[PDB]
Design a protein around this ligand. Structure first.
Ligand SMILES: C=CCCc1sc(N)nc1C(=O)O
Ligand SMILES: [Zn+2]
Ligand SMILES: [Zn+2]
Length: 231
């Protein structure tokens, strides 16, 4: 079964095989007085691994690398951060020290710098406008437009029909919105529909936090977002 927040002590990381060559990584961290789980992705990239997102902090990201080496044993050579918050770039300095080449969009790099967060080294070109998509090894990066944040990316693994939504997509169980400080509530439903439009064949959908689902997570998130702007 997918690991839940109460089963992962802060500082530990779990791996979860989603499909051949595709794992999520799961960690936990404190935020405003509570502990929350957080997902990222790992995708076989030939003889190497591509990492999507840190494990939310330096200590968790070190545990991520150790668990990867223990369970998969291929080198993590590149990482992409899907937006500028700490659950996506916190730990970039650990990855860099470990030899990983770190990447994000120019928007993400700039917003991390304004925020005082860790800044991935390399800029991802070709993602500046809503609906842009670029191929990055075994995945497609896609900018659906502003949502949870103005810079948030999603990631699709074509060989497996896995859609990693990051923080723009909520888990089913979640019925309220919290941490919409940086969000574009008015644009968010339309960005979700841009994802639905571009990835209608997605078999697995991973939210930034919580249990995986299918495309039903998309409409569910819209409802939760719309519920917030009607009150
Ligand atoms: C997880 C849910 C509580 C709010 C937080 S904390 C964090 N690092 N991200 C979020 C989010 O909404 O994406
Ligand atoms: Zn965020
Ligand atoms: Zn988040």
């Amino acid at each position: 079964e997918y690991p839940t927040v109460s089963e992962i002590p802060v500082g530990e990381v779990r791996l979860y095989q989603i499909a051949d060559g595709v794992w999520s990584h799961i960690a936990t961290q404190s935020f405003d007085g509570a502990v929350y789980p957080s997902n990222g992705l790992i995708v076989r990239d030939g003889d190497e691994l591509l990492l999507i997102d840190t494990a939310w902090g330096a200590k968790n990201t070190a545990a991520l690398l150790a668990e990867i080496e223990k369970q998969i044993g291929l080198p993590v050579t590149r990482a992409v951060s899907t937006h500028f918050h700490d659950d996506r770039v916190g730990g970039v300095d650990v990855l860099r020290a470990a030899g990983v080449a770190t990447y994000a969009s120019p928007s993400t790099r700039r917003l991390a710098e304004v925020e005082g967060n860790e800044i991935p080294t390399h800029s991802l070109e070709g993602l500046s406008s809503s609906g842009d998509a670029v191929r990055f090894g075994p995945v497609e990066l896609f900018y659906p437009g502003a949502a949870h944040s103005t810079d948030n990316l999603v990631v699709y693994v074509p060989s497996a029909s896995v859609l990693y939504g990051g923080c723009a997509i909520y888990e089913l169980s979640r019925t309220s919105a919290g941490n919409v400080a940086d969000a574009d509530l008015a644009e968010w439903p339309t960005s979700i529909e841009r994802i639905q439009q571009h990835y209608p064949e997605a078999q697995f959908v991973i939210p930034g936090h919580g249990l995986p689902g299918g495309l039903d997570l998309l409409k569910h998130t819209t409802n939760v977002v719309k519920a917030h702007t009607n009150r």
